[model samples]
Target: REHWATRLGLILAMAGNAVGLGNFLRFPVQAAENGGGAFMIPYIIAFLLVGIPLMWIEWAMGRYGGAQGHGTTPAIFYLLWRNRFAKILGVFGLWIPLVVAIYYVYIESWTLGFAIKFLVGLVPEPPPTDPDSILRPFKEFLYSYIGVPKGDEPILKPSLFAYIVFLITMFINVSILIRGISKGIERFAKIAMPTLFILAVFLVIRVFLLETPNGTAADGLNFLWTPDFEKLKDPGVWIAAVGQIFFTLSLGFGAIITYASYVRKDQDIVLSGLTAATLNEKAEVILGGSISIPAAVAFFGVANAVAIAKAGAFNLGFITLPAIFSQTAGGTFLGFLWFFLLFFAGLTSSIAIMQPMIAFLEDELKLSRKHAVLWTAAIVFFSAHLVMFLNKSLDEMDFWAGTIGVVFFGLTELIIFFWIFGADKAWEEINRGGIIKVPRIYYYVMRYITPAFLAVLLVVWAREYIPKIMEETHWTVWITRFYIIGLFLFLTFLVFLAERRRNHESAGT
Candidate 1:
């Protein structure tokens, strides 16, 4: 199981791993950014077509501007995408590796906070400090079932109730978030998507609940629900909208890929996949999306709730939602369900989110997946503290990890998986295990439509929005950015260390 490579090509492979996302988006990025904007979209169409036709293209590109790899190495002999531009971009973000552990968990933790707040009648304490290695075997076993708990029941201890309540929440939350994607796809998209619910809950909560608004505060409902069609016109309002989509749409982490990895090779992912995609969209569009934020409009003219709007709902939700609840008939019980609902959700999604890096560490690096669960989430647990102190770290990272990093990974995964590896290969894998095969037609769809849509989507997104990410001036902003970058470099080193160790061992064989 340990015989993975980049060995004969060690140097090439090392650089290949490191080169990641041009050698990680170099010339193509240039093509896309060129001649004040002419080259990019064309560049996008050119190099984007599946393989070396564009890979060998010497057409060269533009001077300025915007925009934006990676894969598993294991002995199973899965020929997933592996090469240049891929590794570099792959190593580029720490969150890129342990991404969901960074931002999404923050909000998941928020739900966790609220879930417990009702029980304790206080703000739930933040996560405890990190732990040691050796926990992986146990964690890995639990990893299979962490999303669900099995067994008898205990009644008296409400503290234990958190686990019971939490498992209850993770599954329902999982239902809303999945799009059929693990160890790789399941893990990938589950981790990717579960956050859509989080961001919609958190970010949209921010929109409806914050500061009670200024000029258009009174029109909050129209801005969101009924349609200010006028507010819809404001790009700034859409700033929140764009961020919402990025956060809510799922697919944020590679952890999701790790989630899928545990399934037996001959196992059916299609039905699982259908389960994911189907329920995810249904909940987000109808139940999940409308519920929390709608209350913002009603509870507030949406003048709704004021004092806490500025305090924001999270810290205040513990206070305000309950206040609203206590006033209602049997509202105390309702309050428990509300926070408890999200708490379960938070546990559901956050567990799925961190699993990938742990899986990667175990699968590729052979460190305990348990080691990373502690290490990476510790970063998530710690880095999230910035939001408690100030907006600089919070707002700026939302722009980077949540928005840009989120989309670029889309480009990299599709280009690498569907295009580079060839959709026939990927589609082949899907066709084998499926209790329900992916429609025979979509073999054509993924091969062409998905990549093209991704290309245009990425190009358009970069053109208009890359500039917006730079508007922050806080010291914590840049420091956090640099630290995250270093965190990525650190991830590259981890990959480097593992690759060197394994490639050498493979050398003797």
Candidate 2:
């Protein structure tokens, strides 16, 4: 394994992690769903405030903690607070990814399997008809095992084939980790990411050549660019974008934190996080945006285009994307392109996801890498499979990991950073070596406006999560929230306790 011996290498790697499933599929659906053009309003704002600033914060702290030779949560709180309170926050920071990696790995497994199918000449041709033919095999295989209920949608079903693909993919990822950096992550990224970019460029060019059913490029451009103010009015659209921002950036779940901890102290992560984000944003709006939604217009027709434009954001990447990719000029090749791109994107994120647990085992428990990887994988395998096997659990757990866990953790970090750690100093650190200096006004946004915006989304989203928790178990809303919060607090407390036991009068902070 190669160390990220250069800042550019680390920047690109982190960018690859942030630009995973969300940039390719989710962001387009979000733009389409919200207000095609209107959605970009809050999105751009987020990029400026919460997205870019917070990313720099995570990266800066990561490099800082890494220089001191520690993991993200323990290191951050250990640097900040001298008491049990600070360590408790680190535990909370650690919990979500520990929980998330389980299901995240499952999705990565599916992508891994599909990439093999593409490489092995196993991906079947897309059926001719828009509706019936397209869905035929998908339905046949889907219903054969799960037996879709009389009235229920057939979307949920078992695929022994898919699971085989899943397991094989999982094996590949585990192997990569076992191999370590140079032969594993660095080598894969240099080749795979460049290939992904080339494919994106090709598809984007082809998509521009496509015409709408009305036989007009004008409609095609309009469909992709037009705005529906009504989308911005829906609270769900804002929430979707907000939730997705955290998800796409791999933040709230601790991936960025863990990934950052791996870098050398002089890595210039503030500049790196922003640069990676900027590059990814360009890819999404320019490359992914042009290729996916515009190309989707021709295949799915204007209606599906609008449907995706207005979807809740999360579902489009997985559901709508496959159908769209299956129909492009080099549809098969593009499908291969999309899924394989997803596989590597998932790979970087998976590495990030695995970091916190690995860190916990080594830094605190004194376990070796072999034990941490095996046990962490075991926990994730079981936790994720619980959701995979059941549709009800999948939906509920998706919300839990996708929104509640992510948003709560992100918001908590923002509070701890700005309100607790001193936003002004944080901002100064962000500019340490950057060629571009952020405007001074961002201080208020990072400290106040951004949190206020996130608070609204977090509170509203919690409404649905709370009720779902009630339906799923005996847990009441407060208890559920407290339990989740307590998990974080407890771990953070332990970090402080560990530090206190080690050094009585020393500043654990």
Predicted model with the maximum lDDT:
2
Residue by residue across 267-386, what tens digits does model 2's lDDT show? 466557778878777777777677666665665666666775565333344445555555555555655666687777677777667767776666666567778677766666656555
lDDT of 1 by residue, 1-509 (tens): 21112122211111111111111011212211122123223322322232211111100000000000112322111234345345555553235535444554444444454445555654222222221122222232222322222333211122343344333433433343232222322333334334434543553343343332232222433323332233333333333333333343234344334334434444455554444433433444333434333444444433333333444323224444444344345444555556555444444445545544554565567665346455554565566544434444555665666567765664565565556766666666555655666556666655676457556666666677665645545455776678677767777677667668778889978
Best by TM-score: 2
Q: What are the lDDT scores of the predictions, listed in order?
A: 0.41, 0.65
- Could you tell me the TM-score of candidate 1? 0.60
Error of 1 at 372 (Å): 4.0
Reference-based lDDT, residue 493, model 2: 62
Cα distance off (Å), candidate 1, residue 243: 5.8
Q: How much RMSD separates candidate 2 from the native structure?
A: 4.6
Model 1: lDDT equals 0.41
